[PDB]
Tab-separated table of C-alpha atoms (C1' of nucleotides) and ligand atoms in Angstrom:
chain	number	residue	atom	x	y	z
P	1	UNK	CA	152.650	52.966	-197.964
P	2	UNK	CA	155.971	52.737	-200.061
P	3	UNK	CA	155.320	50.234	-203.084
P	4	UNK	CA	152.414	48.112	-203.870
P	5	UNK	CA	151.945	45.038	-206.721
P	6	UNK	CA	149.370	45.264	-209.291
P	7	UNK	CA	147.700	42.475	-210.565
P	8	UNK	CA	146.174	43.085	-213.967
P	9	UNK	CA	143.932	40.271	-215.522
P	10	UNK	CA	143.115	41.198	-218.923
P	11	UNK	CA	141.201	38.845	-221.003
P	12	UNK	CA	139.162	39.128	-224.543
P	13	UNK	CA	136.001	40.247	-222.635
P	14	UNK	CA	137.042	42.678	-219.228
P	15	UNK	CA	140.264	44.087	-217.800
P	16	UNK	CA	140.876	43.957	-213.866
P	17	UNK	CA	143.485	45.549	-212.238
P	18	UNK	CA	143.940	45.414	-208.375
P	19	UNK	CA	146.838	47.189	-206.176
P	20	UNK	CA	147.695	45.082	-203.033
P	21	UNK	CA	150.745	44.856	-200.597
P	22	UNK	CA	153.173	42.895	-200.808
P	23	UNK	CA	152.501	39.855	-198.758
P	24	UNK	CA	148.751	40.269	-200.354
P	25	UNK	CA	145.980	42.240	-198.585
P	26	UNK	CA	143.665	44.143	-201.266
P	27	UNK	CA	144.037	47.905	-200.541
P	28	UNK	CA	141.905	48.777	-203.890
P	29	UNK	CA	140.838	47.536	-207.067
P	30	UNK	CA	138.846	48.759	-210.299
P	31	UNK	CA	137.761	46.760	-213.524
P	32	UNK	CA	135.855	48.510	-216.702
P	33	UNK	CA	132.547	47.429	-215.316
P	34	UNK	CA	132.747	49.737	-212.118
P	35	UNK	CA	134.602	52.193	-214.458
P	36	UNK	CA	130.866	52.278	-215.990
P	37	UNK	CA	131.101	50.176	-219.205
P	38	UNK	CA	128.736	47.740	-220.669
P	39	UNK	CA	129.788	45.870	-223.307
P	40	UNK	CA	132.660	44.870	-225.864
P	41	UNK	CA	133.622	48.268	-224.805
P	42	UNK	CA	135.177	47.008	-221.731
P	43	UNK	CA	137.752	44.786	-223.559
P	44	UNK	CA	139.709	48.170	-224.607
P	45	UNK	CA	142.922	49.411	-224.318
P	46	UNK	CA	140.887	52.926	-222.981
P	47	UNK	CA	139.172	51.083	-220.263
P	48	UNK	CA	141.933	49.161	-219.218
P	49	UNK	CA	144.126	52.389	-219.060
P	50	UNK	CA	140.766	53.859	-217.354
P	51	UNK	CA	140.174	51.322	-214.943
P	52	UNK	CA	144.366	51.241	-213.931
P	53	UNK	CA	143.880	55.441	-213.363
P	54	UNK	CA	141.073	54.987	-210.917
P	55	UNK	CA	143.232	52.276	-209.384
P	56	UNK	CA	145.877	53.728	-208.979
P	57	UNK	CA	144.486	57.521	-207.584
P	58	UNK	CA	142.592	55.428	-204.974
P	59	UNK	CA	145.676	53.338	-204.250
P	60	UNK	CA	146.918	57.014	-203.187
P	61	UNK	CA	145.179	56.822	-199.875
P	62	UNK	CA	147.999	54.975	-198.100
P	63	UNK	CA	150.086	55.913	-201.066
P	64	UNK	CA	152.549	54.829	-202.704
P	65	UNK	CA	155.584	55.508	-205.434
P	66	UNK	CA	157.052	51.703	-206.646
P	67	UNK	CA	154.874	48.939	-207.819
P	68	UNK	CA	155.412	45.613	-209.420
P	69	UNK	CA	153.144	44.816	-211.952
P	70	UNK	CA	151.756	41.188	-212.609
P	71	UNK	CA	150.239	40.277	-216.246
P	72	UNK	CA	147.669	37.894	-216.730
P	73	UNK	CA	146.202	36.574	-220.137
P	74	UNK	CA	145.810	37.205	-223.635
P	75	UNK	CA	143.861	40.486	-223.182
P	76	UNK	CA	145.717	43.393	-225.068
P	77	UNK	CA	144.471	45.900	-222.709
P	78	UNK	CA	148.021	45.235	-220.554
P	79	UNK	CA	150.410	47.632	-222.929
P	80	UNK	CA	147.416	50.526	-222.118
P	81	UNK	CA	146.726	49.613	-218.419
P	82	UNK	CA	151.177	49.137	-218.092
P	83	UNK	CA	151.506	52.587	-219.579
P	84	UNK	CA	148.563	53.889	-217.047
P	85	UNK	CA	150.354	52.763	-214.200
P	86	UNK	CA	153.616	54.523	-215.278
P	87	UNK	CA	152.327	57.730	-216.159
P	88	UNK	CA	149.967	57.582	-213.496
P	89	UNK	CA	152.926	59.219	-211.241
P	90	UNK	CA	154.535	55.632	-209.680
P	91	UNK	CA	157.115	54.345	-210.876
P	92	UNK	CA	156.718	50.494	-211.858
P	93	UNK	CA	159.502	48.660	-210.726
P	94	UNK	CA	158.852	45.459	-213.244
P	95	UNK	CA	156.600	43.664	-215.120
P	96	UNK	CA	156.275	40.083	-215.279
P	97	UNK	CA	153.782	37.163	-215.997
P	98	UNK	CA	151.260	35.134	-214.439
P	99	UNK	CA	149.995	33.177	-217.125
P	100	UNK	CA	148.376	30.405	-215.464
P	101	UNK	CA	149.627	27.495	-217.886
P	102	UNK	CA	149.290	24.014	-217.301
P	103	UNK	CA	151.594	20.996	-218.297
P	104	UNK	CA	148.849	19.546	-220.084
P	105	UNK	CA	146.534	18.935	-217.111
P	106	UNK	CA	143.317	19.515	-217.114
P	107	UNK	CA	141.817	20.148	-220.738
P	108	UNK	CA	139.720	23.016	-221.907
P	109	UNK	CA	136.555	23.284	-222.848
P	110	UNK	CA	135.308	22.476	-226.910
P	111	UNK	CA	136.499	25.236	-229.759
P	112	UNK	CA	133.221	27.286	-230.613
P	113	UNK	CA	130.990	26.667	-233.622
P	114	UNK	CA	131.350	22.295	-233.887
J	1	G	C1'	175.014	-38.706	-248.551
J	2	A	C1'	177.891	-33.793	-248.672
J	3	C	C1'	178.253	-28.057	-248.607
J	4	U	C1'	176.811	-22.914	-247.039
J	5	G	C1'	175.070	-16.934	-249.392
J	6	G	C1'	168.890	-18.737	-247.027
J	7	A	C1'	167.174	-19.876	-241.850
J	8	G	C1'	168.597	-20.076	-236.809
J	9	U	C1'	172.010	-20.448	-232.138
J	10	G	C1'	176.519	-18.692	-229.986
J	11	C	C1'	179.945	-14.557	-229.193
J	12	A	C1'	180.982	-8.554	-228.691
J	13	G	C1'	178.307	-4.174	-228.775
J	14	A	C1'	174.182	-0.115	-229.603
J	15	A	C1'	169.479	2.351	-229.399
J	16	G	C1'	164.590	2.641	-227.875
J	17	A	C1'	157.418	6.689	-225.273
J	18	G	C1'	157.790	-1.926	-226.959
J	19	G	C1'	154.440	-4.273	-222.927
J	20	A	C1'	152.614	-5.534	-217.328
J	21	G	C1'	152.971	-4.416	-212.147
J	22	A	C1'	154.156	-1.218	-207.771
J	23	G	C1'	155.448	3.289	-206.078
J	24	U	C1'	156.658	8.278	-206.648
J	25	G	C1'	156.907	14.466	-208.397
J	26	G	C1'	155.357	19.298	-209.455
J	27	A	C1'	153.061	22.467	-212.420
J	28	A	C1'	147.917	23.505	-213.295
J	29	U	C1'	141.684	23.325	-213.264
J	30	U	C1'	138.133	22.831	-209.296
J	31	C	C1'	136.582	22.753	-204.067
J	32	C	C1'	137.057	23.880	-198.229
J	33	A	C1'	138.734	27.319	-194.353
J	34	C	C1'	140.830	32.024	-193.168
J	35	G	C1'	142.724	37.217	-193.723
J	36	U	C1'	142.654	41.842	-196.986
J	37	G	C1'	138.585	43.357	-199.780
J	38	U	C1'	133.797	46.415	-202.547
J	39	A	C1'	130.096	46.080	-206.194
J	40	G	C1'	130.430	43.932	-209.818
J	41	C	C1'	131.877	39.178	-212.495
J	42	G	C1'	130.854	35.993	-216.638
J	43	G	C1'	129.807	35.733	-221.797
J	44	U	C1'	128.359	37.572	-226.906
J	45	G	C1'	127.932	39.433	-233.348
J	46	A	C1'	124.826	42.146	-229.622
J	47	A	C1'	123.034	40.167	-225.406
J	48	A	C1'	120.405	37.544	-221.784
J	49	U	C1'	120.063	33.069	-218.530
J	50	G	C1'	123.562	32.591	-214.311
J	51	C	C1'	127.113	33.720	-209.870
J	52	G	C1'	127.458	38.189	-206.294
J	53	U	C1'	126.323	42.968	-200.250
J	54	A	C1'	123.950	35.806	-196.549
J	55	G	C1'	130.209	39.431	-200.009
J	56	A	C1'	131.875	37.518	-204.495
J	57	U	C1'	135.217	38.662	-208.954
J	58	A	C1'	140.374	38.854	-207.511
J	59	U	C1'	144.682	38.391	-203.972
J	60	G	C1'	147.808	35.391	-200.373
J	61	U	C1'	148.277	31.412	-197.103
J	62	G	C1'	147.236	26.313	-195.847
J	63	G	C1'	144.487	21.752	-196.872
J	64	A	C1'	141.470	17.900	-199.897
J	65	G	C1'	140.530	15.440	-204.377
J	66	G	C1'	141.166	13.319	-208.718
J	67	A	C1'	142.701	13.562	-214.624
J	68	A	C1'	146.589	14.277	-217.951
J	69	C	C1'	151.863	14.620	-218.027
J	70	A	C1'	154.730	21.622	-221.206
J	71	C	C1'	159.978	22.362	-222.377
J	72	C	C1'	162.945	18.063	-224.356
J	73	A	C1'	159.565	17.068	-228.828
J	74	G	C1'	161.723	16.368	-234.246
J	75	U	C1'	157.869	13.912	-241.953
J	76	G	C1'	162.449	11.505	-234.503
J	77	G	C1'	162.285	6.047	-231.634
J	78	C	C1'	159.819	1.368	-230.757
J	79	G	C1'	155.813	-2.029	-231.875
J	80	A	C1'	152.498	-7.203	-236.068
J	81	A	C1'	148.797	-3.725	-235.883
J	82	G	C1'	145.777	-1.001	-232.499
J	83	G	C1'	149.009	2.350	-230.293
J	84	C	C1'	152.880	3.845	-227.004
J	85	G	C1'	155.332	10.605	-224.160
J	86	A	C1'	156.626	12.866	-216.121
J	87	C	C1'	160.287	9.721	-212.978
J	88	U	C1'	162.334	5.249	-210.461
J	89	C	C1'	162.545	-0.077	-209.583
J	90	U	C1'	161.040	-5.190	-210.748
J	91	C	C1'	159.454	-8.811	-214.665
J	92	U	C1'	159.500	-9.354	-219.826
J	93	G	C1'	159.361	-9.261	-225.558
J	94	G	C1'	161.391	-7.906	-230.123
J	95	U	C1'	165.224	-5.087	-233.581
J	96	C	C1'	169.973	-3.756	-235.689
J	97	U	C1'	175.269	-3.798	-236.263
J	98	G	C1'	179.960	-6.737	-236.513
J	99	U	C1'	182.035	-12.194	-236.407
J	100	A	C1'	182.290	-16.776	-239.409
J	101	A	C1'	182.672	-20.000	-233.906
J	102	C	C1'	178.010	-23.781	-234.141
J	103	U	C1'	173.550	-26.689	-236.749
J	104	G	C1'	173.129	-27.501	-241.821
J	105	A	C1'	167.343	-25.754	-245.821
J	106	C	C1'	165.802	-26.492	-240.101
J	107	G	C1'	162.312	-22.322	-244.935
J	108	C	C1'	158.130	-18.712	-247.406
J	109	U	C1'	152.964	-18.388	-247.302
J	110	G	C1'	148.972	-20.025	-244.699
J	111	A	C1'	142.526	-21.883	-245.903
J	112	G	C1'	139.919	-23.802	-241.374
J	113	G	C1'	141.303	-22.534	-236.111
J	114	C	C1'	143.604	-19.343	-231.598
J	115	G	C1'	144.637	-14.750	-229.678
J	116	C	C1'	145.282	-9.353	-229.741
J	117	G	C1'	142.561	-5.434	-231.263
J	118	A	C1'	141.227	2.892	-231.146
J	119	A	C1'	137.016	5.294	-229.335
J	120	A	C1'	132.011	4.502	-228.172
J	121	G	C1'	129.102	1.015	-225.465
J	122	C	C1'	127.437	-3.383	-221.615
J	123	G	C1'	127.615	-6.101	-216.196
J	124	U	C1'	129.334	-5.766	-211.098
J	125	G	C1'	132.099	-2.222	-207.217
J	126	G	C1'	134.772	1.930	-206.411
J	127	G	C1'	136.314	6.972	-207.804
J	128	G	C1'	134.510	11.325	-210.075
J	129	A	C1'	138.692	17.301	-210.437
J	130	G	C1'	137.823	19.076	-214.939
J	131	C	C1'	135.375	18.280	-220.151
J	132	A	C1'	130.715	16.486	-221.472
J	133	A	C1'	126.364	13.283	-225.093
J	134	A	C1'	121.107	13.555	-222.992
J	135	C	C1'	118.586	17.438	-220.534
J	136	A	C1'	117.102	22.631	-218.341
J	137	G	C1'	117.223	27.784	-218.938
J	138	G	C1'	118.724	32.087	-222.113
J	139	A	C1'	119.558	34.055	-227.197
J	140	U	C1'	119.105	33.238	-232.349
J	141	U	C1'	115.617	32.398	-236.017
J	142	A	C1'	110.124	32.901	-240.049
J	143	G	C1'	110.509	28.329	-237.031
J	144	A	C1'	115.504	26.097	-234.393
J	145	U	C1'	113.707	19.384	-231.402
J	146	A	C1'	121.023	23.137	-233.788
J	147	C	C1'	125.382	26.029	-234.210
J	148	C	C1'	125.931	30.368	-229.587
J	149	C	C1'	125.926	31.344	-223.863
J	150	U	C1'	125.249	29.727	-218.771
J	151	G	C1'	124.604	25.105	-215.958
J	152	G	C1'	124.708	19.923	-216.296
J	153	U	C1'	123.535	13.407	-215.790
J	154	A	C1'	125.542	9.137	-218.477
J	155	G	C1'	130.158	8.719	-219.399
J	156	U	C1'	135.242	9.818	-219.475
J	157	C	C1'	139.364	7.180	-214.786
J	158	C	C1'	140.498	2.382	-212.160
J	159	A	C1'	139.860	-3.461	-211.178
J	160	C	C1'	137.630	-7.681	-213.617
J	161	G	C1'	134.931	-9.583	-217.655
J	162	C	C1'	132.221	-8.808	-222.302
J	163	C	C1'	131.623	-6.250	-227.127
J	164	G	C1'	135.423	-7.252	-231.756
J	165	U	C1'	133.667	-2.207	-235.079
J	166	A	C1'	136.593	2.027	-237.524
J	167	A	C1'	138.579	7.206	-243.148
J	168	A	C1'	141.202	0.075	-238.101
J	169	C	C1'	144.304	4.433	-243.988
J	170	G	C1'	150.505	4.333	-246.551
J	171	A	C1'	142.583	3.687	-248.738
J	172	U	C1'	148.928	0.332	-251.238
J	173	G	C1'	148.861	-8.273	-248.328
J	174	A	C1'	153.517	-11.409	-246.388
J	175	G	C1'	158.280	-13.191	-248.574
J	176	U	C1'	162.727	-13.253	-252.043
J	177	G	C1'	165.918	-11.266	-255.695
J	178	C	C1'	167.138	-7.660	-259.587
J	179	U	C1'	166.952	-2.536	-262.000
J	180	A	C1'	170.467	5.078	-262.178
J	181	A	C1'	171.074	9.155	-259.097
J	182	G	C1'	171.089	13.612	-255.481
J	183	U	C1'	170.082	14.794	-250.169
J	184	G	C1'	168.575	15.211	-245.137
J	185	U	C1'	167.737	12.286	-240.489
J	186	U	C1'	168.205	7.961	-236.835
J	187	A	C1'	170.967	3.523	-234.795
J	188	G	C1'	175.844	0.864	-236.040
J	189	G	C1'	180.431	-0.858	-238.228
J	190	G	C1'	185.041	-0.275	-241.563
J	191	G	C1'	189.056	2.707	-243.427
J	192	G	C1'	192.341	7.642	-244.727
J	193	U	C1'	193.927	12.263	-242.245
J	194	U	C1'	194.591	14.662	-238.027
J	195	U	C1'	196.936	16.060	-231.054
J	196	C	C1'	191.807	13.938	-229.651
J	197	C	C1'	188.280	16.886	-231.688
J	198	G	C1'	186.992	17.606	-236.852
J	199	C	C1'	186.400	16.234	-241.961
J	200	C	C1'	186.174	12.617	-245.998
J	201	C	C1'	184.832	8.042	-248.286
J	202	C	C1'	182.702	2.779	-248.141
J	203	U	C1'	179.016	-0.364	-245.994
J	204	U	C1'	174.400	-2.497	-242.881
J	205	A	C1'	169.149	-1.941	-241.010
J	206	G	C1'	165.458	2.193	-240.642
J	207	U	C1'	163.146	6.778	-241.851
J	208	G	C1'	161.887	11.119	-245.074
J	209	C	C1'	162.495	14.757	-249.525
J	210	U	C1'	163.393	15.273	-254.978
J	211	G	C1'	164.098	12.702	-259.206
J	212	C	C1'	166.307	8.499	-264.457
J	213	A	C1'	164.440	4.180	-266.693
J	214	G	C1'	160.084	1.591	-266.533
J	215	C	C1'	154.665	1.262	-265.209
J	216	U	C1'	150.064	3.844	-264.850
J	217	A	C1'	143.598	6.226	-267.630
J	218	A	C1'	145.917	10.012	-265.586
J	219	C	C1'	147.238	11.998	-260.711
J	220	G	C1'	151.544	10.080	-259.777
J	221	C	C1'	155.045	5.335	-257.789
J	222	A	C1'	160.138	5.491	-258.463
J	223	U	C1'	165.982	0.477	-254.136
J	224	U	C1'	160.403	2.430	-248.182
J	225	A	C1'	158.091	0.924	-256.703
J	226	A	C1'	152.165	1.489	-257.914
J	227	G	C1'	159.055	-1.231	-261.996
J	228	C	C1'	161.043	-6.357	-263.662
J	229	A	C1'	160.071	-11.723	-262.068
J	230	C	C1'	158.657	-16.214	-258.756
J	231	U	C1'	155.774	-18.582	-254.297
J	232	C	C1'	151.560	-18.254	-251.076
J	233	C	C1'	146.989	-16.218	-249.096
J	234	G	C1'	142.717	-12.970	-249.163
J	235	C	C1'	139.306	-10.345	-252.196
J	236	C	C1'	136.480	-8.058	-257.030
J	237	U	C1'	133.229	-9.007	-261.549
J	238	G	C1'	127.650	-2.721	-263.411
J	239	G	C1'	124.580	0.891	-259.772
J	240	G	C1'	120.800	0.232	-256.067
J	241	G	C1'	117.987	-3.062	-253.197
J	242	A	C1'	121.785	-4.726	-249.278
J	243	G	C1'	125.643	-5.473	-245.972
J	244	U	C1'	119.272	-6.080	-246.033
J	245	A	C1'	116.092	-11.021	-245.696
J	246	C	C1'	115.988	-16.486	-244.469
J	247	G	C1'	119.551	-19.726	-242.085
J	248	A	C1'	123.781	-20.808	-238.849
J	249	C	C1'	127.520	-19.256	-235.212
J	250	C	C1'	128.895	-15.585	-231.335
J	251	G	C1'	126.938	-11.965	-227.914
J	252	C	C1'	123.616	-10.365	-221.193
J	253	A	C1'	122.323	-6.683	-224.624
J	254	A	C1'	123.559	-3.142	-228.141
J	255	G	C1'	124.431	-5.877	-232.081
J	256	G	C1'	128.574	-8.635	-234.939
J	257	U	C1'	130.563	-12.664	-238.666
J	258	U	C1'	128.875	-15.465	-243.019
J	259	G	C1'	125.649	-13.743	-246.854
J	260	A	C1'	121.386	-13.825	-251.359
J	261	A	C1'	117.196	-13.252	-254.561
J	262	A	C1'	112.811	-10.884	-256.574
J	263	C	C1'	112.547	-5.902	-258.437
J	264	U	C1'	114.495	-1.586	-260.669
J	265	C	C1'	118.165	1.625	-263.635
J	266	A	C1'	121.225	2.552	-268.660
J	267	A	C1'	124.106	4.026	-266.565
J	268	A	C1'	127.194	4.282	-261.754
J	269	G	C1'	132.111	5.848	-261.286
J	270	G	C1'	137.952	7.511	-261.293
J	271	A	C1'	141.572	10.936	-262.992
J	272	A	C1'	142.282	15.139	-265.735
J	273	U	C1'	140.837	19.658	-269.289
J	274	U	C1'	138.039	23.953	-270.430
J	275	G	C1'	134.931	27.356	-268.306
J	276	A	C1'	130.961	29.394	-264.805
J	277	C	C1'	130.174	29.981	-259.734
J	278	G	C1'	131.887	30.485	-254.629
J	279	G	C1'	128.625	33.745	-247.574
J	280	G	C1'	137.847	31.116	-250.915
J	281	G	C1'	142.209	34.094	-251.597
J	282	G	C1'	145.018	37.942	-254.190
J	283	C	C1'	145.743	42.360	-257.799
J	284	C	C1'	143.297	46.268	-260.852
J	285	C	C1'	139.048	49.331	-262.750
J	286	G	C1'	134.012	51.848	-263.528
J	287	C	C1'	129.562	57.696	-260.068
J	288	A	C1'	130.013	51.296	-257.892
J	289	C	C1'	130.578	52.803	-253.107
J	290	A	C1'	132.284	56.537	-249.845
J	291	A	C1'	132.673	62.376	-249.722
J	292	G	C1'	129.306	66.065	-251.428
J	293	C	C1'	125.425	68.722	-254.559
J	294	G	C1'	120.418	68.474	-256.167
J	295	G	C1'	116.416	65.276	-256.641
J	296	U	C1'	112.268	60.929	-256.688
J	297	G	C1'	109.032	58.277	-253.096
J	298	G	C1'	104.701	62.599	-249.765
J	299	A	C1'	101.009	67.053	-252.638
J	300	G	C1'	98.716	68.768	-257.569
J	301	C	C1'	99.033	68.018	-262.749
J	302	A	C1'	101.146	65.793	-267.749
J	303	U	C1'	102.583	61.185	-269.849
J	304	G	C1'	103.157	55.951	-270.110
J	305	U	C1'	102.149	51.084	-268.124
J	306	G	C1'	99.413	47.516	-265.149
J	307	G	C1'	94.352	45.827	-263.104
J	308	U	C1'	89.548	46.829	-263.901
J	309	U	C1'	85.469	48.167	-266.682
J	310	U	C1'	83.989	48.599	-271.649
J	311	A	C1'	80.282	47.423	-278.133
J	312	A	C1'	85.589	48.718	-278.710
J	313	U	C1'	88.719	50.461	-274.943
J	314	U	C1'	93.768	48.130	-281.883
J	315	C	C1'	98.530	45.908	-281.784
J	316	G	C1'	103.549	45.516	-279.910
J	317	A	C1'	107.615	46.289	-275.629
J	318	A	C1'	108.155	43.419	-269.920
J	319	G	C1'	114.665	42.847	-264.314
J	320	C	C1'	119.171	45.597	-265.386
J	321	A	C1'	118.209	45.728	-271.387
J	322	A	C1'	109.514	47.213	-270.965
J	323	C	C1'	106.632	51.462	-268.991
J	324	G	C1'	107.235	60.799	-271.817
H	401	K	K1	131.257	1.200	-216.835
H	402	K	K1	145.326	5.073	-237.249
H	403	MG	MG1	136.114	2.244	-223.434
H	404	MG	MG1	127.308	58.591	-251.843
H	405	MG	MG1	104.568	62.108	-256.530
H	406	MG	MG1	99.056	48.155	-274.339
RNA sequence: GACUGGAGUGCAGAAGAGGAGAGUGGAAUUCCACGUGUAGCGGUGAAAUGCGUAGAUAUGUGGAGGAACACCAGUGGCGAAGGCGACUCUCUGGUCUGUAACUGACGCUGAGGCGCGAAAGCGUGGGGAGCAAACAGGAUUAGAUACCCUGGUAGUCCACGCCGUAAACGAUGAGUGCUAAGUGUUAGGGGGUUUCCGCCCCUUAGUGCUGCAGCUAACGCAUUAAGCACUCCGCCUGGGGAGUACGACCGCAAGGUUGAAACUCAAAGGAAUUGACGGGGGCCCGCACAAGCGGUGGAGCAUGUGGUUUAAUUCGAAGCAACG
């Protein structure tokens, strides 16, 4: 009811963004897709700042003011959606980073075009 | 017979992902369960196949399973090479530095043999999370038995045993000595100075950069020589056929090692130079685009050209650069 965390995964194809509580139980979430897009359109800073709006003014129903916010991957939606969530009317406590990275476990897939 | 600069042992130190075994750690991919949770997720140049209200995607908690080990990490270390990166222990190999104690040429190479030997692959039995040949579906395309997407078996991992190939490459055989420098970097030693620290110089074995002589067809090599010399081995003698065929040996097999001729060609090729080109880069320009104006292509006619039909339909011009 007081502060939330966002978890933002942006990526080179779709921006998510969902506010839980603190110790984790989804209150809402919104992603470019629901926001109505279709394409390479949803990869945008606009739909990721879009998407974080909607979030956020549904994450109003038990309301909030704080929230930390939680990065994830290279998508470059996360200044946009970061800026959505501040001017939104919250105010984001901090930002930090969960880019899943592995100490060379397992490997990834082939590079495209070989 | 004698000696010690080679070679080796001893003695005092130093580094190290050198190798085998056993155990161990947490990231992190996936999966199982459970909450919260609502309609998308994924992916592309666009998509679609696909997953999803029988509830995902995500988010937290806990659990299972295997594979590889960020930072350190560096033209840095070690190793004969292949190659070796998380940690600890055990068992082991080799290297360098200093000494001049010890032996006293005991050495260098090394055909034929013996072993090791990336990855793929083969046999048996496990494991199999991810990635993934083959394959399926979806796109793409003129077609696509491909690039591209979603899935996915062999495999990849382990034990044991085979296979013994590689752009297995520094495309540069092992050994010895000699022939200018400058500079990093690693592991050591010696000395001058200084409170150690720190700076400096000399030297040993490595590893890299740049360069003198000299060599080289040149590119370039240059005390880590592709220099000057000696020993030993292996290999070459135009291209292709052909690393094929016969033969032998090895191999469960896949296939490997050894290795020709007939026939054919008049070249094949290396390095470098000048251009031209480039679905390479960079800089600059032109009505070249873009921004705009008005037009052609549509209609009718004039003209020219083509094709045709003609006794003849004179000849010439033919992308820009022929066709009022
Ligand atoms: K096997
Ligand atoms: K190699
Ligand atoms: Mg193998
Ligand atoms: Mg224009
Ligand atoms: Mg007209
Ligand atoms: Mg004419």
């Amino acid at each position: 009811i007081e502060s939330g965390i966002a978890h933002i995964r942006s990526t080179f194809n779709n921006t998510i963004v969902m506010i839980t509580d603190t110790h984790g139980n989804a209150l809402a979430w919104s992603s470019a897709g629901s926001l109505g897009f279709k394409g390479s359109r949803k990869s945008t800073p606009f739909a990721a700042q879009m998407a974080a709006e909607s979030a956020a003014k549904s994450a109003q129903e038990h309301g909030l003011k704080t929230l930390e916010v939680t990065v994830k991957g290279p998508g470059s939606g996360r200044e946009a959606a970061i800026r959505a969530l501040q001017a939104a009317g919250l105010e984001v406590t901090a930002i930090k980073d969960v880019t899943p990275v592995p100490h060379n476990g397992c490997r990834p897939p082939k590079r495209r075009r070989v």
